[PDB]
Each structure stands twice: as structure tokens, then as C-alpha cells.
């Protein structure tokens, strides 16, 4: 009850601007006034409302409006015009029992949403065309007969290897992924082993560390190299048989 007194022309304009389309319909069913890119709709005035609704919407309008009384609340019904859908909120006015239909067009929201969905799909498809480096990496590592193991310096765990390395270490690739690298070699421990590797890598000596692989019981020579890869610190071990 905070609104001030409002002149009738103002009330009309507030409704007109708030709603997307509003219809004032006589007690007898005739469109008296249309307030609305919708098309002119000028031709609707003076016509029975049923002439501009689909037959399904005629049935719905008749059902929702017949029991609608002044000062007894309002009722919402989705109607389709002769087709496009509008949410109408119906009020019966007490002075003359006309029905004021306050319409919200929900099509614009839908179309805007479609734009965003289509943009997302297009963007995702653009990135699909640039995922080549993971594939190149996988294929080159797998095909290469040079035995190699890649280790996370952060975790000390094997992040990748090829079948050639697997043979020397004594397990299939899939069983070595995630394994602690130091524990693959007899008498080695994570801390001291990573220090050994890191130190040798910085010397660039490439003179190998002698290890004995736990699984295969093979003595091996390990040549370490350390590098940064977009925020990831990695150790690459080249492996050769020793004995």
C-alpha cells in the first residue's frame, strides 16, 4: 500500500511497458484494446478474442475465464495466437466485467538461450581441432624403441613409459603407471634417489646410475633429464641394460 495515487493514463502506460502484450476484452468476448515487432495487431481490435486464438487456446481461455470474478485474484494461462505462445495473467475488472489479459512473451528468452548454446557448441568444436599434441606425444612415445620412463618430480611416481621400458623393468606398461620410481630399484628410497637423479641431470654428464630392477632382476643404466612442461616438473629416464 505504498504506491501513491496514479492517474489513469499513467496506469495504462505502466501496464503497457511492463507486459509484452496486453488485451482488454469485453464481457461479451470482443477485443476492445490491444497494447503492444509483434506485427501491427491493429486488426484485432473490434474482433472476438476467439478469432485470434488456436482452438486449443479457445478451450483453455473459456475454462479459465468463466469462473473468474472481480477482486477474486488472477489466473495464469498459456495461450497460443493464430502460432505463438504467451503467458497471460487474467483479471476481471469490476466496473464492466471486462477481462484484462497481461501477456509475457517467453520466446525472446528462449532464443537468447539458443544463441548461448550454439556459441558454446561452436567454441568446443574449435578446440577439438587443436588437440593434436597429446596424440603426437602418445604415438611417438609408444612407437619409439628407445626405452623411456617419465616421472613426476612432485610425486616421485611414473606418469608414463613405453613398452621398451616395460620390458627392462619387468612389467607391462599399465602395471607400472603410477608406481613409485625408487621402489622399482633394489635398495633405493624416494628422497635419495630423486636427489641422485636431479643432481646428475644438472651436471649434464649423462653418465648413468646403476640400478637393479626389482621386477625383472635386470641390472640397468639410467640416464636422467629434468625439464619443465607448462608448470609441470618432469624427470625423463632413458634406460639401457647394464650386464
Amino acid at each position: 500500500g505504498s504506491l501513491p495515487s496514479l492517474a489513469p493514463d499513467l496506469v495504462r502506460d505502466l501496464i503497457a511497458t511492463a507486459a509484452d502484450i496486453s488485451l482488454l476484452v469485453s464481457q461479451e468476448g470482443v477485443v476492445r484494446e490491444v497494447m503492444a515487432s509483434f506485427g501491427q495487431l491493429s486488426e484485432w481490435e473490434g474482433r472476438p478474442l476467439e478469432e485470434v486464438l488456436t482452438a486449443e487456446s479457445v478451450a483453455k481461455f473459456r475454462l479459465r475465464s468463466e469462473g473468474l470474478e472481480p477482486g477474486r485474484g488472477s489466473v495464469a494461462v498459456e495461450l497460443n495466437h493464430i502460432e505463438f505462445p504467451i503467458r497471460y495473467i487474467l483479471h476481471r475488472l469490476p466496473a464492466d466485467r471486462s477481462i484484462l489479459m497481461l501477456g509475457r512473451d517467453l520466446r525472446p528468452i528462449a532464443e537468447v538461450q539458443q544463441q548461448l548454446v550454439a556459441a558454446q557448441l561452436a567454441m568446443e568444436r574449435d578446440y577439438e581441432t587443436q588437440r593434436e599434441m597429446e596424440t603426437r606425444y602418445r604415438v611417438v612415445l609408444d612407437v619409439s624403441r628407445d626405452p623411456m620412463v617419465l616421472v613426476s618430480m612432485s610425486t616421485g611416481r611414473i606418469v608414463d613409459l613405453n613398452s621398451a621400458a616395460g620390458l627392462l623393468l619387468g612389467g607391462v606398461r599399465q602395471d607400472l603407471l603410477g608406481a613409485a620410481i625408487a621402489q622399482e630399484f633394489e635398495g633405493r628410497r624416494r628422497g635419495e634417489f630423486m636427489e641422485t637423479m636431479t643432481n646428475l641431470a644438472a651436471t649434464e654428464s649423462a653418465a648413468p646410475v646403476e640400478v637393479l630392477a626389482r621386477r625383472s632382476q635386470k641390472r640397468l643404466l639410467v640416464v636422467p633429464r629434468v625439464f619443465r612442461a607448462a608448470g609441470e616438473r618432469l624427470l625423463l629416464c632413458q634406460i639401457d641394460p647394464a650386464d
Binding site: 544463441q115 548461448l116 558454446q120 561452436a122 607448462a230 608448470g231 609441470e232 616438473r233
Partner: protein
């Protein structure tokens, strides 16, 4: 030619404000012609962002429209600039957004510019100060670039100040260099030191200059 150059900001802003996805090829064409390096792309993007910000302020475009523009720019960037992370590096740097903000394009541009001049770079859009600190420690990175959101409002300034303060308040990041951009970097240089940042880049394309200064001292 240079006629094209003079018109680039206006033409791009129009394309981005109207049908950015439908005319993405034209957007790409303009950027290909006038952004031969990521720094050039950053200069053109930041100019366009000022225009988009003003258009939104006058309700000539909607936030939805800015969002579409921003996606199209990201696509155009990746059709043109995508440098490998350099293996022969002058140092390591991490580019991060401020929690609660998504400077996706700006952080990508920062990474392109830094990679272009020899920095091994990583990019994080962190959930929190703690998560970012964790990434700094794991990657053993001692230089942090805070990417500004050029198309987000002024609340990000106070957010960035609280962010930088929170970082400095910790004790687990000794020796960390911090660079900030956007409005905070545009203050008189004397004010900059109080915030806790080591250098400011007043525009996105001035980031390499700022990093060079920090790396020196």
C-alpha cells in the same frame, strides 16, 4: 593498409557487439591482419573492451552480448596465437585469475606474451588463495602475474587488494614476486608499493615491461 589499421578497433568492436559468432571469420580476419603478435592482440582487445564496457553502461548492448563477444575473441585468439611453452627459458611464471573472477582471455594473452619472450609459463584459475599457494609451491614458481578482468566491474579491485594482502599475510610463500594490472596498476607508482604488489602493468600489453623490471631487481 594503415587505413585498415586506423579502423581496426571500431570495426572489431562493431563485429563483437552484433554478430560475433556469425561473423567470426571477419573477426579472425581483422585480428590476423592487425595482431601479428600477442601483444598487438592485447592492445586491440583492451581498446575494444573499453568500448564494450561503455556500450554496456549505456545499455546499447547486454551482458549476454558481452559474453558472446568474449567467447568469439577466445576462439579467434586460438586460431592465430598458440605458442609452445619455451624449453630454453629465462625463468618460470604463473598467471592466475582472482577467485570469483574469470579473466580467461586476459590470462591466455598474458601467457602468450610471456612465452613469446622466453618464460616457462603456467595458468591457473584458482578456487581460493590456498589452492593458488599450493600450485605456486608444487610448480616451484616464484613469480605470480594476476590477470585482470577487463570486462568485469570495479568490485574486482577491492577483491584483488584482499587477494594480494591474503597472499602476503601467509608465511609459506617467501620471496614471491607479484604483478598486478587493471585499475590498481594505474595509480601513481608510490601507491603501488603499499598494496603488496612488486610491479603494475597499466595495460595488458605492458606486462612484459613490468616483468622485466621485477626480474631485474
Amino acid at each position: 593498409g594503415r587505413s585498415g589499421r586506423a579502423k581496426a578497433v571500431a570495426r572489431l568492436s562493431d563485429l563483437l557487439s552484433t554478430d560475433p559468432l556469425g561473423r567470426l571469420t571477419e573477426v579472425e580476419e581483422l585480428l590476423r591482419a592487425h595482431a601479428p603478435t600477442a601483444a598487438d592482440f592485447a592492445r586491440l582487445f583492451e581498446a575494444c573492451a573499453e568500448r564494450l564496457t561503455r556500450a554496456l553502461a549505456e545499455d546499447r548492448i547486454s551482458r549476454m552480448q558481452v559474453t558472446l563477444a568474449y567467447s568469439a575473441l577466445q576462439m579467434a585468439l586460438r586460431r592465430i596465437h598458440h605458442l609452445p611453452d619455451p624449453q630454453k627459458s629465462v625463468g618460470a611464471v604463473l598467471v592466475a585469475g582472482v577467485p570469483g573472477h574469470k579473466p580467461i582471455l586476459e590470462a591466455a594473452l598474458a601467457a602468450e606474451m610471456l612465452r613469446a619472450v622466453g618464460w616457462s609459463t603456467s595458468v591457473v584459475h584458482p578456487e581460493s588463495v590456498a589452492a593458488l599457494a599450493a600450485r605456486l609451491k608444487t610448480s616451484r614458481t616464484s613469480t605470480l602475474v594476476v590477470a585482470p578482468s577487463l570486462l568485469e566491474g570495479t568490485e574486482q579491485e577491492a577483491d584483488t587488494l584482499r587477494f594480494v594482502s591474503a597472499l602476503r599475510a601467509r608465511t609459506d610463500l617467501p620471496g614471491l614476486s607479484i604483478l598486478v594490472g587493471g585499475r590498481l596498476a594505474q595509480l601513481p607508482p608510490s601507491k603501488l608499493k603499499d598494496s603488496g604488489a612488486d610491479a603494475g602493468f597499466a595495460h595488458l600489453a605492458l606486462l612484459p615491461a613490468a616483468l622485466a623490471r621485477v626480474a631485474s631487481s
